[PDB]
Amino acid sequence: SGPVPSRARVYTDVNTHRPREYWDYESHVVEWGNQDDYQLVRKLGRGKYSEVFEAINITNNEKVVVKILKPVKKKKIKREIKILENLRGGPNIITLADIVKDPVSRTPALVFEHVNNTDFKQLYQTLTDYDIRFYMYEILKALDYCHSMGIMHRDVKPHNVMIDHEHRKLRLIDWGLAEFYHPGQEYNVRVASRYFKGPELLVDYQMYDYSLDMWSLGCMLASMIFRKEPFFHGHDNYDQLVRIAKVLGTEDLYDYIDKYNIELDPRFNDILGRHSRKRWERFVHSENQHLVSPEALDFLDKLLRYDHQSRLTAREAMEHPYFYTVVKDQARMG
């Protein structure tokens, strides 16, 4: 027999209770505008699925960002668009302003609100203890929201968090890998970027959920507090699990595999070995100790579990003592 099934422990059925068209994105009709409404100013960045440009809307002279999509299935473009429309106006969610095609090339492009500066990777190795907590809290708002709206991001990583440090503002971007959660659905495990892939993805357990994003978040938190980028530095997908196993231990890994009756790719037979679960103090040194606290380690420990079911939810994470000061400072300002 095969793998034991799994269900999300929160927001399990939110898509089921919705009208069909909320999640049945293949049926969504897209009104394509004219890219000549926009003049490209400069290239901001590039990816596997898109190139991103600063641009001007010539009709009202506003600054925007244009994300020209690399060729993918129509289905996937509809998926990203529907998800962006569904989450529009949600906390710390990038705002879609328009959808266009170049009239010559016919290449599809998404147009977003202009967001001020850095990708998170440029500063997240030089933030204060408080700022790590502050921005982590802001990310959790986005994740709790999108999970509550029946959506998993599936590519949480520093490049996909845009911070305006001047205005203390954050947006979660690049919803191109996001999907609707449906209980019992088996998902593609070729998602997320290598260093942020959850064990479920690495061992090919397909019946995953929102909790995937919480592992990714844990990887980010660990790189920031211990200043080791990335925290789990694998050479490939198999070695990525080995790197995790050398920290989290092999006992919990093999219990995870047994619990869900997962069939391990034979490649893993020799390389996983036998490793203890390491205490977090092993990663604490002079330069990083000001970012590490008992609260930080307790929080981190509760994100980074093999068993997706054992990880904190976004709302549970937000209620952790690590955030108590952030929370009280926020009720102060109003």
Ligand SMILES: C=Cc1cc(O)cc2nc(-c3ccc(O)c(F)c3)oc12
């Ligand atoms: C990459 C640099 C970059 C810089 C910047 O100041 C704003 C940006 N906004 C995007 C963006 C928004 C939504 C997406 O879905 C996406 F993929 C990218 O990338 C940006």
